[PDB]
Design a protein around this ligand. Structure first.
Ligand code: EGT
Ligand code: EGT
Lengths: 814, 814
């Protein structure tokens, strides 16, 4: 519509700017897409605009990288197996201040820019929180003027496209490069060899890794624009390519596929270590090519590796790139011929490690035999690291043999394994958790032994989200009513949102907050109708739980509440209840039968609830298909209630929680992860906090969790388990949910029933507030106004000062 | 050098043209290659110029295709499994008249354009003659203003890169898309489904092909510029892509490779049918996607399929796309619901078939079981075609049962097979050979039965080469001395070269012809030094045999001559002989042990000859590595003597013969293929014709070829076989050549020894003429001057008028 073109936060439609954009658009359509308007599809128009927008950061990208070469700052390398980037077109336009100019130029050409934006494929190179965190981090590091590089893998297929067929998840290949990627620049001239297998021989000079198989790593560079500071940083993603030279000639050519399979697809396993050789190869591939780049940049600067930690930070996003530690030692000792002790000093001062979960099944514990076959030299180095590290433990804690056994990089058993978390702590000068409660649990329990050896190593860095994608882009309406009162500085200084507490009693701001939410809901309600012919009641409370499907996130607890609301309506059909649209979305890991069963249960509950004429428009429950970064940008601004209901102690931080808080949703949740700090910032009176705290969970584990006690004492819970058992939600297959029932009653590691009573009552309080629109909106104002801490600019500023030793700067390039 | 910039045939360096080219060059380097001159490699500079040159044909390409849509001419579809295109940059510049402007613009930027041209990968999507013929044909059809489309497969790997290691061929993957292809435009929006396997069911309506596996065919469009007529035609190459939807999720994603393997690599088997399922899939893939395109274009024009043959010609390059015939019948009968007899009338009037060899092992004879599994509906249609075709044979030739058995599409035996040549003749209104002697043998022997049923079907179309790539581009020096005398019209009217017979006695032209040859030889001699550190004597006769390595091409006969020259020098070291550099090059099919042994024999003869101090610079024999279109453009203009020495009756035409004739080489050859017509055009007195004619070969077959008789009667031959046997050319492995010796003495299908005596004497006459430079050059003038018939413009004009029913035109577009 025109209205959106009038949005001040979207910048200026300069006459000359608009004229040049139209000309460059038409130029790309003719010379780049080789089409005239006669035959051009919306896809052609999307690509013409994407090429036009990309041209506007080429000068800045070249100048930024030239500026780092000349000024030689310390370089930050963010190593991750995942970059959950989403779409690039709107983000680029926001960060370059081109959004209103492009909007006007496309409008004058007869085009709806927002329809074109829907054509762009997500770069879905992530599973969830960790991947999206890497993405928010690249944006904040560019905005803070850091000389920062994202390093990862250019997966041919990202996280699988989820279809729901017969109420079940079906997985399809996320063919995101089908139509090409206008953002990336292939750098095949900067291709590097990566080695696999082979053997270690010992020459006059020392160890030599020989007889290896080569896979080439071909880098692809994507631009990362800072917010209006003329800074354009690089995300470098490596693509696997079969080496130059070699069933027959034909089979040998087809067999190039096996090496190229290394970058073929993202492992969709979110919170579970599988131990697949191909995943190990992906981890070594990204670490090996990346560290060659890092060493090359270091040596072409203003040799003596003493200065390497003053010019390089390597940040390990989880244990996935943990092989950086032995790889850096391998390069320094075997190729640069440093003494072991000097090499180790350099390695520890270079590397830092971010831990993202305490869940034991997440821990990377590679079989020694697999390491011995694939990476023989890395295994030798790991054993040497282990010897020297345990010698330090023995000196600090003389005769504490149990501690030596617990701290060892080597795990004894039927299969001997390397603990990659232990390797990361040993080879890193800093270890951080991703929220205060998580970082304290790391020092208290999980890494207590490591904390006692080296307390100075252990840090907190509470996660954050970029206010650019998660407010200005996704919710320009809310960004606009904020700018109208406090100006635009908050977009890169989010603590300025605290100025909004001055408007808790301002009739105009109260009106405007509620109006923006209603607009967002009408647009999302429309979306469901247009793309899925799904009708939702737009005067309903939007109750949203979007995140990966896991027992620990307790989508099942949400299911028990939804069926509780259904059964209360049936018992007292005459009694008024606040109408709800309950939306659950997210992907289940291919495999995880239980996660796939929970998706079927959500759709099955919907099948009953949504067709009961007594319920009608008072309650609707819908499974949002293919939850991904692009769909998060649509549903989160439309949300009234944010479900953050993980068992206390299980969610290290969460970032979806922060997105909802920034976009004018109230939160129902446990005192878990960053929920604790969110409630602290806003005041607990402005959060719907319920359920067991970590210490209540621990007291239940101490005496044993008996789900039967809850079943016996709670009539409403008993009625629901009996509906699930007897086939009420699967009449044509009455035993369909027996595995869910049996897990809840006898094998529930996440104590669903133990929080049921507090959850249902807490949800009653939510409904009671929603019936009072003014006080609902006033409480929302108090949440948005205190969301500033959860800016990833704040997080990155802390990494820069406390771990990397660099000073951030919002000062602009010319 | 500057001199080449002064070449009038290379066009004008307009001041504004040069200024715009430099600006667009710098523009591409910044916005396309994202590099500033600081860091730019010669590769960046090549790509910047390629993008700049490509931009200059975008308007013409769009207008040409729009012009065909509006004027609705009959469309020519040239279906081939091979397009042996070579490099595109220089060809584009020649056809757009930009060569001197680009040369000047790059010069002003401090760049050598010819060094940049060496960076471009050949599009090596061909094996040899048939593939390069398809390439010359696209060029001539554009130059003749035909509404012509090349349709083929976008192989990820073309013909293998040949390395010589220890004197043996080694094959490497021809990774021609490593750095990208600036010429092609991906059209993923015009992606089409191709079906494989499945089964035939019979509904109310008729046959239905069901339960198939889908492979997507994604088209890539390359421009084909005519010579300065503003015409830009299309080569559409299909890429295999796994369908949208589906060992586990991960194995299912990796298994997309199996479908994508269909377009992975060119079968390097030049003159041998192998019967590989994957080759059958490539043949159906190109035919199926192509015929969907053809039908779509037909229906979006100014339904009734009665007009289809008035608006479509399908030219089948060999039997490789022979499935077009049953596929067109399948579409017309099963999907468009035409009566069988009407469908057949349409199919025969649409399709024509070009035969390229009489060698039995070349004939495509697919097992019926393979067809039944992969293409069940095509097999049914082929059986129906066969029934109706043999019914016509039975009516024409009542009671001739032997003729029914010989003409059948179905070949009886242990394995029953479909003869694809028989299918092509049945389903085509025209059948042609590729030289007069070949086309007459087709009517006399191979297809005699078919000629007798339908004599009107059988045509000759003598092959040709484009005078653009094979004279103006590769030999601008010779193009220039010709233009100086007769102007530039000959470049698209090559019969104008006959005007050069007026200069046989012209002292200045004689001087200039010899000077251009000497320049070409000095440049090729330099090339060997720069790229291979190989020294050649530049006052030596350049004796060149470049072509695929096959027993029928008799590289071995050349080897016996080279060793004859070596042994004569050793016997009479004091006797003067014309110094020679004997150059043999070409690829052996992976497999063909004998072809690989012949390459080793050439290098082994070189190892002795090139290190014998008695011989010194008087005789050098070198194996030219990686013979391909780009290397043909270098060596052929430097050649003095063209070896075309195939056994009479074995080479259908040849095109290398024509390239040498156009570039000022004299020819030693058999009365075989187009050699016959070349000698007829120039006068036999201007050719070194030797050896058995077809009827002498036939008389030897009638009484039996006994190689021993030649061995017993020829002392010099006996001495050579004994050197090969005893290990003179393999001292460290004395029996290394026993298989070559045993084949020559007992299993020689190509009668090498039978032409030995005439060959050696004919070579004596060559040397005798070379000792007289004036008369050598005068005879060259008489060859170049009469090469005009062998223009592919002449060939295409004949296809257009005699088979396609369209009138050619050199008249320009605005
Ligand atoms: O930021 C948002 C928020 C939303 O709730 C929606 C958004 C974008 O775009 C969708 C959409 C789909 C299409 O298929 C279109 O063509 C189109 O223009 C917009 C739909 O309106 C819902
Ligand atoms: O048409 C011809 C004819 C030839 O005989 C040669 C040609 C081109 O280019 C080669 C060459 C190789 C390189 O590596 C270069 O850099 C370069 O400029 C030229 C070499 O001179 C030999």
């Amino acid at each position: 519509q025109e209205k959106r073109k009038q949005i001040s936060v979207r910048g200026l439609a300069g006459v000359e700017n608009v004229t040049e954009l139209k000309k460059n658009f038409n130029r790309h359509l003719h010379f780049t897409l080789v089409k005239d308007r006669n035959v051009a599809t919306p896809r052609d128009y999307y690509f013409a605009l994407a090429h036009t927008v990309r041209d506007h950061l080429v000068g800045r990208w070249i100048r930024t990288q030239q500026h780092y070469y000349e000024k030689d700052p310390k370089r930050i390398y963010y190593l991750s197996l995942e970059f959950y980037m989403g779409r690039t077109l709107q983000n680029t336009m926001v960060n370059l201040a081109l959004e209103n100019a492009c909007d006007e130029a496309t409008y004058q050409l007869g085009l709806d820019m927002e329809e074109l934006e829907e054509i762009e494929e997500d770069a879905g190179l992530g599973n969830g929180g960790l991947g999206r965190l890497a993405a928010c981090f690249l944006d904040s590091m560019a905005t803070l003027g850091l000389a920062a590089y994202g390093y990862g893998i250019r997966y041919e297929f990202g996280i699988f496209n989820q279809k729901i067929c017969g109420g079940w998840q079906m997985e399809e290949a996320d063919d995101w490069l089908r139509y090409g990627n206008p953002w990336e620049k292939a750098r095949p001239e900067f291709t590097l060899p990566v080695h696999f297998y082979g053997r270690v021989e010992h020459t006059s000079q020392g160890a030599k890794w020989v007889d290896t198989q080569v896979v080439l790593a071909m880098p692809y560079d994507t631009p990362v624009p800072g917010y209006r500071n003329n800074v354009v940083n690089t995300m470098r993603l490596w693509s696997a390519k079969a080496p130059n030279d070699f069933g027959g000639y034909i089979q040998a050519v087809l067999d190039r596929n096996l090496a190229e399979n290394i970058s073929r697809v993202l492992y969709p396993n979110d919170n579970f270590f599988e131990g697949k050789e191909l995943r190990l190869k992906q981890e070594y591939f990204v670490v090996a090519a990346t560290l060659q780049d890092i060493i090359r940049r270091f040596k072409s600067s203003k040799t003596n590796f003493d200065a390497f930690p003053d010019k390089v930070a390597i940040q390990l996003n989880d244990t996935h790139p943990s092989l950086a530690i032995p790889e850096l030692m391998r390069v320094l000792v075997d190729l640069e011929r440093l003494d072991w002790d000097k090499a180790w000093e350099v390695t520890v001062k270079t590397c830092a490690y971010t831990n993202h979960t305490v869940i034991p099944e997440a821990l990377e514990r590679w079989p020694v035999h697999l390491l011995e076959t694939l990476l023989p030299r890395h295994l030798q180095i790991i054993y040497e690291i282990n010897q020297r590290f345990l010698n330090r433990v023995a000196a600090a804690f003389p005769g504490d043999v149990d501690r030596l056994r617990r701290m060892s990089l080597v795990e004894e058993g039927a299969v001997k394994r390397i603990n990659m978390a232990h390797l990361c702590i040993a080879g890193s000068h800093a270890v951080n958790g991703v929220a205060r409660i998580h970082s304290e649990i790391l020092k208290k329990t999980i890494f207590k032994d490591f904390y006692e050896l080296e307390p100075h190593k252990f840090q907190n860095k509470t996660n954050g989200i970029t206010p650019r994608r998660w407010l200005v882009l996704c919710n320009p309406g809310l960004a606009e009513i904020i700018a109208e009162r406090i100006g635009e500085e908050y977009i890169s200084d989010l603590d300025q949102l605290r100025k909004l507490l001055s408007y808790v009693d301002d009739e105009a701001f109260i009106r405007d907050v509620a109006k923006v939410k209603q607009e967002n809901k009408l647009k999302f309600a429309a979306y469901l109708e247009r793309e899925y012919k799904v009708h939702i009641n737009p005067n309903s409370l939007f109750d949203v739980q979007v995140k990966r499907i896991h027992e620990y996130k307790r989508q099942l607890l949400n299911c028990l509440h939804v069926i509780t609301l259904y059964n209360r309506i049936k018992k007292e059909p005459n009694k008024f209840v606040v109408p709800r649209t309950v939306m659950i979305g997210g992907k289940a890991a291919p495999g995880y039968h239980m996660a796939k069963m929970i998706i079927k249960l959500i759709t099955a509950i919907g099948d009953v609830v949504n067709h009961d004429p007594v319920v009608g428009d008072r309650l609707r429950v819908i499974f949002l298909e293919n939850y991904r970064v692009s769909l998060a940008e649509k549903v989160i601004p439309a949300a009234d209630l944010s479900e953050q209901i993980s068992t206390a102690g299980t969610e290290a931080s969460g970032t979806g929680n922060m997105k909802f808080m920034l976009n004018g949703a109230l939160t129902i949740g446990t005192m878990d992860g960053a929920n604790v700090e969110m409630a602290e910032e806003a005041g607990e009176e402005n959060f719907f906090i319920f359920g067991m705290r970590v210490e209540d969970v621990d007291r239940l584990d101490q005496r044993g969790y008996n789900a039967q006690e809850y079943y016996d004492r709670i009539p409403e819970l008993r009625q629901i388990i009996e509906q699930l058992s007897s086939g009420f939600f699967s009449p044509k297959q009455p035993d369909l949910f027996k595995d869910i029932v049996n897990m809840l009653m006898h094998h529930d590691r996440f104590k669903v029933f133990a929080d049921y009573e507090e959850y249902v009552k807490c949800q009653e309080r939510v409904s009671a507030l929603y019936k009072n629109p003014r006080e609902w909106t006033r409480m929302v104002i108090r949440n948005i106004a205190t969301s500033g801490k959860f800016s990833s600019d704040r997080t990155i500023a802390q990494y820069a000062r406390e771990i990397w030793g660099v000073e951030p700067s919002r000062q602009r390039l010319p």
